[PDB]
UniProtKB/Swiss-Prot annotation, chain A:
Organism annotation: Saccharomyces cerevisiae (strain ATCC 204508 / S288c)
PTM per Swiss-Prot/TrEMBL: Phosphorylated to form H2AS128ph (gamma-H2A) in response to DNA double-strand breaks (DSBs) generated by exogenous genotoxic agents and by stalled replication forks. Phosphorylation is dependent on the DNA damage checkpoint kinases MEC1/ATR and TEL1/ATM, spreads on either side of a detected DSB site and may mark the surrounding chromatin for recruitment of proteins required for DNA damage signaling and repair. N-acetylated by NAT4.
Top-level taxon: Eukaryota
Transmembrane intervals: none
GO cellular component terms, A-Z: nucleosome; nucleus
Gene Ontology MF terms: DNA binding; protein heterodimerization activity; structural constituent of chromatin
Protein name: Histone H2A.1
Residues recorded as bearing N6-malonyllysine in the entry: K107
Induction: Transcribed during late G1 and S-phase, repressed in G2.
Modified sites of kind N5-methylglutamine: Q93
Comment, domains: The [ST]-Q motif constitutes a recognition sequence for kinases from the PI3/PI4-kinase family.
Name of the gene this protein is made from: HTA1
Site feature (Not ubiquitinated) residues: K107
Residues of the full protein shown: 14 to 121 of 132
N6-succinyllysine carried by residues: K1, K9
From Swiss-Prot, chain B:
The gene coding this protein: INO80
Protein name as catalogued: Chromatin-remodeling ATPase INO80
First and last residues shown, out of full length: 707 to 1016 of 1489
Organism: Saccharomyces cerevisiae (strain ATCC 204508 / S288c)
Further details from the record: Present with 1110 molecules/cell in log phase SD medium.
Complex formation: Component of the chromatin-remodeling INO80 complex, at least composed of ARP4, ARP5, ARP8, RVB1, RVB2, TAF14, NHP10, IES1, IES3, IES4, IES6, ACT1, IES2, IES5 and INO80.
Domain comment quoted from the record: The DBINO region is involved in binding to DNA.
Motif (DEAQ box): 135-138
Lineage per the UniProt record: Eukaryota, Fungi, Dikarya, Ascomycota, Saccharomycotina
From Swiss-Prot, chain C:
Family membership noted in the UniProt record: Belongs to the SNF2/RAD54 helicase family.
Name of the protein described by the UniProt record: Chromatin-remodeling ATPase INO80
Compartments where found: Nucleus
Complex formation: Component of the chromatin-remodeling INO80 complex, at least composed of ARP4, ARP5, ARP8, RVB1, RVB2, TAF14, NHP10, IES1, IES3, IES4, IES6, ACT1, IES2, IES5 and INO80.
Organism expressing this protein natively: Saccharomyces cerevisiae (strain ATCC 204508 / S288c) (Baker's yeast)
Annotated Helicase C-terminal domain residues: 17-136
Biological classification of the source: Eukaryota, Fungi, Dikarya, Ascomycota, Saccharomycotina
Known role: ATPase component of the INO80 complex which remodels chromatin by shifting nucleosomes and is involved in DNA repair. Its ability to induce transcription of some phosphate-responsive genes is modulated by inositol polyphosphates. The INO80 complex is involved in DNA repair by associating with 'Ser-129' phosphorylated H2A histones as a response to DNA damage.
Cystine crosslinks: none
Coiled-coil annotated residue ranges, if any: none
Domain characteristics, as noted in the entry: The DBINO region is involved in binding to DNA.
Gene name for this UniProt entry: INO80
Additional comment: Present with 1110 molecules/cell in log phase SD medium.
Superkingdom per UniProt: Eukaryota
Swiss-Prot record, chain E:
GO cellular component: nucleosome; nucleus
Domain of life: Eukaryota
UniProt main location, coarse: nucleus
Modified residues (N6-succinyllysine): K11
Name of this chain's protein: Histone H2B.1
Species: Saccharomyces cerevisiae (strain ATCC 204508 / S288c)
GO molecular function: DNA binding; protein heterodimerization activity; structural constituent of chromatin
Assembly: The nucleosome is a histone octamer containing two molecules each of H2A, H2B, H3 and H4 assembled in one H3-H4 heterotetramer and two H2A-H2B heterodimers. The octamer wraps approximately 147 bp of DNA.
Subcellular location as annotated: Nucleus; Chromosome
Parent-protein residues present: 37 to 129 of 131
Length: 108, 261, 136, 56, 93
DNA sequence: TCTCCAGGCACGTGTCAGATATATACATCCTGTGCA
DNA sequence: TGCACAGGATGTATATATCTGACACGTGCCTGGAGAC
């Protein structure tokens, strides 16, 4: 009779019932459908996986084993669609990209 | 209860002169109980239960606190080792704001390690000490050691050296230890070099060094005899001697120890 | 065919002579300290001691500080312990080895002052019998 | 009441620190036989007075 | 009691990079990020469901919301991952 | 809405990376002295 | 007046010994997600 959660029923590692709880007492609609928390759980799981993949090779490009928000900031702003998504957000301890305009160099 | 009592009285006599002493004798005759009797008689003299510092290697630190607790349990012992939270607890307890002599306080004797002294120089630069005792001073042989530098920078003004053999002969070590004894007179090493060689080196340290030996008591200790065994290499221990030079230290040392290494 | 244990002993002549003198040292029923210079030297001796199933303990630089208390306590209380694997400067600085007399210096030739501290560790007051310092 | 609570908290902190400092400063057989498994197997016993043959 | 997505985020980087540590500040950055996408998607879906005179939020409403908020490439990857997950969940027969 | 049990939190204990240290011999560089 | 040679000093080079230092894993618990109607 005992069965496991909906997350591994959908094959997901993010909590489906917790997403359903936050949807129901988040006061967005009075009736919440069944397939909506599974869809939202899959979307947020994929976005987290893509973000951690980008932070992963950004941290391998610095020869380290830990993730600093320098790596997160770099992995955000060298990718164009995350640039478009996260344009107006500022990350804690991020800094800026190394850039210099063409005529400002010692051209000679 | 031995002839270390007159030796500690001679140490107190040169203390009354106002200079730091040198123990230049081998371990085995009981310099630990001699030093705790130095502290006990000095406390009997001018009524000081207060700040006393013991700098000691970590393996014999437990031996030191064990013999202190067994022999003279009148004082209150403090260790300085472990994690950072225990370090902060002992920093809460060893608080010695009241200067000079104190009675009802647990900082009577302070035991610690060499590394721990080296790595808490920011906290040990304060808490101006009265009597540091550094046992086994061979690690302050070098004058380039940063531990030697932070041992220089304290505000204790007593630099009694305890070691078994101070005679490691690198010709800078003697100047380094003498510069630790008086900081003030010994600072130029070139004048120490420039100012018959075997005879004139004996009476320089004569008013400071005391001359004792192990062959003065009754010898049931064993009178140790050195039996030396010299043996020959095996063939597997032979051919790597040619192999190592065929491609061309501690390397051949360990091949001598055992081939598998 | 596995690496033979006796072939591991007999291919090293220092270990060969050590195995010869341990036979009479255990036949007399004595107390033995053995010194080494490296970790890998004491990473090989206990395999030889498992052949003899001797009571042996090891103290080195990577040992935790509390274990050095109860190991010395078990040395000065239990008499059935036989082999004392010691580092150069660990057990040779002020450690009470008063009931021991036979020290085995495997490679104690790095500096004479460390060796002087080493044989000041066992040759101490309270020793009831003669001290024989072996040097292979 | 506040002074008594402060004194009790100071006493508790002093007791905990003294216990930690006392614990840090003062405190910081026959081999078993092989297992014998004889399942689904016959048995021959030879005692002093009588013999057995346990079969299936 | 306080809630965090720390263990789930942890196993997410453990499928892709096993020998990789994490900072607590980076974990807080990631938690704020996923919560921000969650509230954006939720308010878009609730606003769209109110706009279509419907009292129920279903999968097609957040489908339109994901088409609306995310840029197109990441949008069709997101809806593809969501459709395989939802069709796998719906096969409880 | 009733029931009910294990998920994930919270809080303990151990294990490979950095930092001073010995250390002796060998090699390189600089300085001084002697010679043309 | 310059150049070369020799001698002395300093630096290097690679396991130890210690030895912390901040990291990852083995147990409680309680409550909220899951099944049933």
């Amino acid at each position: 009779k005992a069965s496991q959660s909906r997350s591994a029923k959908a094959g997901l590692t993010f909590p489906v019932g917790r997403v359903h709880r936050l949807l129901r007492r988040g006061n967005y609609a009075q009736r919440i459908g069944s397939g909506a928390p599974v869809y939202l759980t899959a979307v947020l799981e994929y976005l987290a996986a893509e973000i951690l993949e980008l932070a992963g090779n950004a941290a391998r490009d610095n020869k380290k084993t830990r993730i600093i928000p320098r790596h997160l900031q770099l992995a955000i702003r060298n990718d164009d669609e995350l640039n478009k998504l996260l344009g107006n957000v500022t990350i804690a301890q991020g800094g800026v990209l190394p850039n210099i305009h063409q005529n400002l160099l010692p051209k000679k | 209860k031995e002839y270390q009592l007159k030796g500690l009285n001679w140490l107190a006599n040169l203390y009354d002169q106002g200079i730091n002493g040198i123990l230049a004798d081998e371990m085995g005759l009981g310099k630990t109980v001699q030093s705790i009797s130095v502290l006990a008689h000095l406390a009997e003299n001018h009524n000081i239960w207060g700040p006393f510092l013991v700098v000691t290697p970590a393996s014999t630190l437990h031996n030191w606190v064990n013999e202190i607790s067994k022999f003279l349990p009148q004082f209150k012992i403090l260790p300085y080792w472990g994690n950072a939270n225990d370090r902060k607890v002992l920093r809460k307890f060893w608080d010695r704001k009241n200067l000079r002599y104190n009675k009802n306080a647990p900082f009577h004797v302070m035991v610690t390690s060499y590394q721990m002294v080296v790595t808490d120089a920011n906290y040990l630069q304060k808490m101006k000490w009265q009597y540091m005792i550094l046992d086994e001073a061979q690690a302050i042989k070098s004058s380039q050691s940063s531990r030697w530098k932070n041992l220089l920078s304290f505000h204790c003004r007593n630099r009694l050296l305890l070691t078994g053999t101070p005679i490691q002969n690198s010709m800078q070590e003697l100047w380094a230890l003498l510069h630790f004894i008086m900081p003030s007179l010994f600072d130029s090493h070139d004048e120490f070099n420039e100012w018959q060689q075997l005879r004139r080196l004996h009476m320089i340290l004569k008013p400071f060094m005391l001359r004792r030996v192990k062959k003065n008591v009754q010898s049931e200790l064993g009178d140790k005899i050195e039996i030396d065994v010299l043996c020959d290499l095996t063939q597997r221990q032979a051919k790597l001697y040619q192999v190592l030079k065929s491609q061309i230290v501690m390397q051949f040392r360990k091949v001598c120890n055992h081939p598998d290494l | 065919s596995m690496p033979s244990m006796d072939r591991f002993i007999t291919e090293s002549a220092k270990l060969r002579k050590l195995d010869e003198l341990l036979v009479k040292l255990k036949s007399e029923g004595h107390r033995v300290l053995i010194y080494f210079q490296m970790t890998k030297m004491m990473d090989l001796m206990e395999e030889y001691l498992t052949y003899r199933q001797y009571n042996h303990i090891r103290l080195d630089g990577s040992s935790k500080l509390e274990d050095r208390r109860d190991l010395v306590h078990d040395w000065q209380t239990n008499p059935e312990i036989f082999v004392f694997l010691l580092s150069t400067r660990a057990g040779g600085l002020g450690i009470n080895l008063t009931a021991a007399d036979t020290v085995i210096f495997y490679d104690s030739d790095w500096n004479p002052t460390i060796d002087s501290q080493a044989m000041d560790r066992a040759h101490r007051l309270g020793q009831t019998r003669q001290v024989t310092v072996y040097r292979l | 009441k506040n002074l008594s609570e402060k004194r009790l908290e100071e006493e508790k902190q002093d007791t905990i620190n003294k216990l930690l400092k006392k614990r840090a400063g003062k405190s910081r057989f026959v081999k078993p036989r092989r297992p014998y498994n004889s399942e689904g197997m016959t048995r021959i016993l030879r005692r002093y007075e009588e013999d057995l043959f346990c079969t299936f | 009691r306080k809630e965090t997505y720390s263990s789930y985020i942890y196993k997410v980087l453990k499928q892709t990079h096993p020998d990789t540590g994490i900072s607590q500040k980076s974990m807080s950055i990631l938690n704020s990020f996923v919560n921000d996408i969650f509230e954006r998607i939720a308010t878009e879906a609730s606003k769209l469901a109110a706009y279509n005179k419907k009292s129920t939020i279903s999968a097609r409403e957040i489908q339109t919301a994901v088409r609306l908020i995310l840029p197109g490439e990441l949008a069709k990857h997101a809806v593809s991952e969501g459709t395989r997950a939802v069709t796998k969940y719906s096969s409880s027969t």
